[PDB]
Structure formats: C-alpha cells, structure tokens
Design a protein around this motif. Structure first.
Motif, short mmCIF file in Angstrom:
data_model
loop_
_atom_site.label_atom_id
_atom_site.label_comp_id
_atom_site.label_asym_id
_atom_site.label_seq_id
_atom_site.Cartn_x
_atom_site.Cartn_y
_atom_site.Cartn_z
N UNK A 155 0.82 -1.21 0.00
CA UNK A 155 0.00 0.00 0.00
C UNK A 155 0.85 1.26 0.00
N UNK A 156 0.48 2.18 -0.88
CA UNK A 156 1.09 3.51 -1.06
C UNK A 156 0.32 4.23 -2.18
N UNK A 211 -0.39 -0.16 7.43
CA UNK A 211 -0.13 0.57 6.17
C UNK A 211 -1.26 1.54 5.80
N UNK A 212 -2.49 1.17 6.13
CA UNK A 212 -3.65 2.05 5.97
C UNK A 212 -3.50 3.32 6.79
N UNK A 213 -3.05 3.16 8.04
CA UNK A 213 -2.76 4.29 8.92
C UNK A 213 -1.78 5.27 8.31
N UNK A 257 -5.97 7.08 13.83
CA UNK A 257 -4.58 6.82 13.49
C UNK A 257 -3.74 6.21 14.63
N UNK A 258 -4.09 6.52 15.88
CA UNK A 258 -3.43 5.90 17.04
C UNK A 258 -3.74 4.41 17.16
N UNK A 259 -4.96 4.03 16.78
CA UNK A 259 -5.38 2.64 16.81
C UNK A 259 -4.94 1.83 15.58
N UNK A 260 -4.53 2.53 14.51
CA UNK A 260 -3.96 1.87 13.33
C UNK A 260 -2.44 1.81 13.40
N UNK A 261 -1.82 2.91 13.83
CA UNK A 261 -0.38 3.00 14.02
C UNK A 261 0.01 2.57 15.45
N UNK A 262 -0.49 1.39 15.81
CA UNK A 262 -0.32 0.79 17.11
C UNK A 262 0.70 -0.35 16.97
#
Length: 338
Positions: A155-156, A211-213, A257-262
């Motif tokens: 993802x990008x 990666x979504x984050x 974003x905190x719950x994805x970039x965890x």
C-alpha cells in the motif's frame, strides 16, 4: 450485516478459480506498442492497443533474467496467480497474461487518470472528506482480500489509480501472498513498513492495517508520518512508536490513526475481536455509507481531466526502448507454471 453472506460467495468463487485457472490467453503480436508509462528495476508498464479491437490496455513487461537475479520468482508467480483469481470493484482487472523467450507479460485495464501520488503532490494535501472517501475503498478492499487469506503488503499512493469516475483501482500485486498464519519476507516501501516486519520476527495480515494508517496520514498531511534521509533512520522512528500529528488534523482522525499505528498487535484495529468493524464503526467514518461506496453511488470529490482513450498526459515521459525477444528461451523451469 449481509456482508458475511457476500464474502462467503466471494470465497467460493475465488477458491474455484484458485483451483482451476484459465491462463496463457494472448500474445505480443496482438498488441501495438504506444508509450512507456513507467519503469522499474526488473520491468516496465506500457500503454498498448489491442490490434483487432482498438482497446487500450496497460501491459506490464517483466525481464525473466532480472526477475531471477533480484530473487523475485515466487513474488511474480504469486502476482499473476492472485490477479487471475480475485474480483472486486477497486482492484485492476487482469485481462491477458503470457510469456515468450525473454519476457513475462501481464495485460491489465488501462487507468488514464494516473497515480494518486501525482494528484497528491500537485494539490499538496487532501481534505479529510477527500481522504476518507479513498480510505473507505481501501478498508473494503482489505476486508475482501483478508477474508481470502490474502495479504497485500504494498500500500502507497503510487499503487492507487484514479478511474474516470474518481474511484480507486489498486495495482501491483507483486508482494501479494496467500497466507494462513505467518510469513517472513522483508519487503515493502520503507515509509509503509509495520514494526513487526522490521523486527524480523514473523507477521500476518495486520501489517496491511498499519499501512492504511500511514496512507491516511499521508493523504491528510501531504507527507508520511515516519520520514528521514536514511531508510535505517525511518525504521528507528517506526519501532519507537511515537507519531506527531499536524495541528489541522481533527481529533477523530488522530484517534483513528493511534489505533492503526499501534505497535502492540493485541491493540491494533482490524486485528481485534470485532476486526474490521472497529474501523468501520469508528467515529471518523460515521458519515461513510459503506454500501454506496461499494456500489460506486457516492459522487467523487475529484474527477481527473479526460482527454480521450489513449491520452497519457497524466504520466511522465521515459526513453522508449525496444522489447527484445531472444531466439533462445530463458529461465524455462523457473517460470514453467506462469
């Protein structure tokens, strides 16, 4: 609700196609070369016209010997095999695939609107409703892929193409793999790598949610959350956990974003007991109509300028080079099942 029912039917269609492929379905002679759309370390993508329909396509051309040397044999085999079997509105369709003495060929749907990356750099940043519109499509795409035990891993914005209706088409399945449980390959773009990939300990589909984050952050900010000159310095930022958000970010966005970039896998959204519903029912996605996004009934925030079929102004220019077919067959056994 009825998603469970749709996904069962999708799995049965995927497993039928995984088991019994249709393959080796065209030849280079049937296509007229127009323009090189992009280059890489082991191949290129060209705009091509089908000679007896006039239909335009994007043809991925991979050099076999360069695939062999760069250790990309299994990855390339996975890509073609996965693309033949899947069917979803936000995945670029594979139309034809074949091989000759020197090259491997993957003929795909041509998307004239270009990379999201190009649009993002020109505008600077996307507004939160604009970013959410794109994010919604990736969420649905990953829900589809993960239920088939498929990991995407690449993802990008560069791999996200904008069609004539303003919707996303995901391209490049070069790192895609069917995996129950764990996998080990250290592949991906440095900015987008989840901490558990870097730590070389084995990972699962949860890396896609990380990666979504990164993607949502980059769409909304205009730059990625973990950045430095050196890729080694980027890895250090990723593993340290810490993220700084721009002040213009809504507090609902910062929370998603905190719950994805965890870093902690037992706490990362998408991986938990509710799974994908933790993301879908999150406050930042409250105005999203998931069904209407799937059906492409939501009016798009951006429609690229259309200049006819076969226009390439949305793409960069490259030194046009011959497609050299050798008289001797190269790497026969390596790609025998391609």
């Amino acid at each position: 609700e009825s998603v469970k029912e749709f996904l069962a039917k999708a799995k049965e269609d995927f497993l039928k196609k995984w088991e019994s492929p249709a393959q080796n379905t065209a030849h280079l002679d049937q296509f007229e070369r127009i323009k090189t759309l992009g280059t890489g370390s082991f191949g290129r993508v060209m705009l091509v016209k089908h000679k007896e329909t006039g239909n335009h396509y994007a043809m991925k051309i991979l050099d076999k010997q360069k695939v062999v040397k760069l250790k990309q044999i299994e990855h390339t085999l996975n890509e073609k095999r996965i693309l033949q079997a899947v069917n979803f509105p936000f995945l670029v369709k594979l139309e034809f695939s074949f091989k000759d003495n020197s090259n491997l060929y993957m003929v795909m749907e041509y998307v004239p609107g270009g990379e999201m990356f190009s649009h993002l750099r020109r505008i600077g940043r996307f507004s939160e409703p604009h970013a959410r519109f794109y994010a919604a499509q990736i969420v649905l795409t990953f829900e589809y892929l993960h239920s088939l035990d498929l990991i995407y891993r690449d993802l990008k914005p560069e791999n996200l193409l904008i069609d004539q209706q303003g919707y996303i088409q995901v391209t490049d399945f070069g790192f895609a793999k069917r995996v129950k449980g764990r996998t080990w390959t250290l592949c991906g773009t440095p900015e987008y790598l989840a901490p558990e990939i870097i730590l070389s300990k084995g990972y699962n589909k949860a890396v896609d949610w990380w990666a979504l984050g990164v993607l949502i952050y980059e769409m909304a900010a205009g730059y990625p959350p973990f950045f430095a000159d050196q890729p080694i310095q980027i890895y250090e930022k990723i593993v340290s956990g810490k993220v700084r958000f721009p002040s213009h970010f809504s507090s609902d966005l910062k929370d998603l974003l905190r719950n994805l970039l965890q870093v902690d896998l037992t706490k990362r959204f998408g991986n938990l007991k509710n799974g994908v519903n933790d993301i879908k029912n999150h406050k930042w996605f409250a105005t999203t109509d998931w069904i209407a996004i799937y059906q492409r009934k939501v009016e798009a925030p951006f429609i690229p300028k259309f200049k006819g079929p076969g226009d390439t102004s949305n793409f960069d220019d490259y030194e046009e080079e011959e497609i050299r077919v050798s008289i001797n067959e190269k790497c026969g056994k390596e790609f025998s099942e391609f």
